[PDB]
Amino acid sequence: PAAPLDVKCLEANKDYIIISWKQPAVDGGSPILGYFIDKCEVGTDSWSQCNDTPVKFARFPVTGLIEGRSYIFRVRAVNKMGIGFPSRVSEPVAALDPAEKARLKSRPSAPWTGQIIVTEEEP
Amino acid sequence: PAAPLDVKCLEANKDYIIISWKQPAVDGGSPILGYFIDKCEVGTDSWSQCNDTPVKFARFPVTGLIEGRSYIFRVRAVNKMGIGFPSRVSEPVAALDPAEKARLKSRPSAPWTGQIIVTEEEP
Amino acid sequence: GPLGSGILMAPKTFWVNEGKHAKFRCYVMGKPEPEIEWHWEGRPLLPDRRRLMYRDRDGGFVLKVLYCQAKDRGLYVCAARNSAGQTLSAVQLHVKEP
Amino acid sequence: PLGSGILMAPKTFWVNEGKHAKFRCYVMGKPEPEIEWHWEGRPLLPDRRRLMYRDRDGGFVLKVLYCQAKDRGLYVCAARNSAGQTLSAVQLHVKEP
């Protein structure tokens, strides 16, 4: 089956993140029995399958989030024959309550300045 | 009188900083009665005269330092026929006890990552 | 506040024309010298003929993907880590097909 | 955010007299920190000879054109925002022909 489209995050919390997606183009090969959702902690390259059996409902709550860490998501469609390739991955989603994300986003940090690199140029 | 040379810091503390300098090229205009030392907190452009009357001894302890702030220094020679221009300013000197300067210098800092700047090129 | 760009905020999207090169520049600060690596769509990016990585003289690390194809679209992440911590920056590449 | 050449001794970069000298410095901060240059404890102001602009690669640039022996000294890049201020320093020496 064709890969699902437009993976986005509807809602996000320390506890769980609810992610949705657009259904792929109807190939008529075998009806889509459901979908598998995979999560990855942004830094690592470890992709883990969130649901053990397929889900039909095109919005899904993801659990098992380490608080304060940011995650990306992909979806794979599944039919009778097997599983398709993954969707284009989502924008990163941080596992924070909305107020803490707002707080961090609008927080000042003292400036840092790099070494001054001096070079000669020719008039 | 000619401006003094090589303004260097001999010793540095939270309490005071001892700064030395090389005497300028000797002239038959008038004997050097002493010197004036000026300090400036690195960020600001405010230069303050440390000693009210000239000092002959070519090393001088500077007080009135706000702890943890970094300072630069210049010296002006003075004779019977007035005060000369200032010396080339010193390397910055932080008002910290030696152990605290060592501690800060060898302290690990978590990495910070800048925005990714994407640009188009062609061969 | 080492939060890193495009991780908490939504990453920027930069469009590139198909067949042309795309340069990704990212400046990073840290003691000790933080080791950096690139990722694409949650996969590690590895030096190829097509994909090249070097540190630009005058500071920051560069990733260069040559002769962009539609398939090259995705989330590009610059991960940087040292003894004290790790921080990521992210960005999205879209490809303009002729 | 300690800043280069303030706690450590600043680097000394030699330039040939009559040539241009480019000073590049990258700075991070929220909010966007306002930056200013200083020379020998004096504020540096945009002249025909002295130019200041922010590079397309990011980072702020100071360019002193047609270096003279008198241009020697401690060049400091000061950057400040609501939360704080941090400086970087460097020393320029001029090679006379």
Author numbering:
A (entry chain N), B (entry chain M): 510 to 632
C (entry chain P): 242 to 339
D (entry chain O): 243 to 339
What do the authors of the reporting publication say about this deposited model?
Obscurin, or its homolog obscurin-like-1, bridges the giant ruler titin and the myosin crosslinker myomesin at the M-band. Myomesin is a 185 kDa modular protein that localizes exclusively at the M-band, where anti-parallel dimers cross link myosin filaments. In addition to a mechanical role, myomesin is also needed for the integration of obscurin and its smaller obscurin-like-1 homolog at the M-band (Fukuzawa et al., 2008).
While the myomesin My4 domain and its C-terminal linker L as well as obscurin-like-1 OL3 are well defined in the structure, the entire myomesin My5 domain is invisible in electron density maps. The OL3:My4L complex is present as a (OL3:My4L)2 dimer of heterodimers in the crystal. Individual OL3:My4L complexes display a bent dumbbell-shaped structure, in which the myomesin L linker extends away from the My4 domain integrating within the OL3 fold. LH leads the C-terminal portion of L, an 18-amino-acid-long extended stretch divided into two β-strands (LS′ and LS″) that integrate within the OL3 Ig fold. In OL3, the A β-strand that is hydrogen-bonded to B is missing and is replaced by myomesin LS′ (Ser618-Thr622), thus re-establishing a complete Ig architecture. Thus, OL3A is a complex trans-complemented hybrid I/I∗-set Ig fold. Overall, the OL3:My4L interface area is 1,046 Å2. In the case of OL3:My4L, this binding mode provides a surprisingly high mechanical stability to the complex (∼135 pN), a rupture force significantly higher than that required to unfold OL3 alone (∼85 pN) and quantitatively similar to that exhibited by the myomesin C-terminal dimer (∼137 pN) (Berkemeier et al., 2011) required for myosin crosslinking.
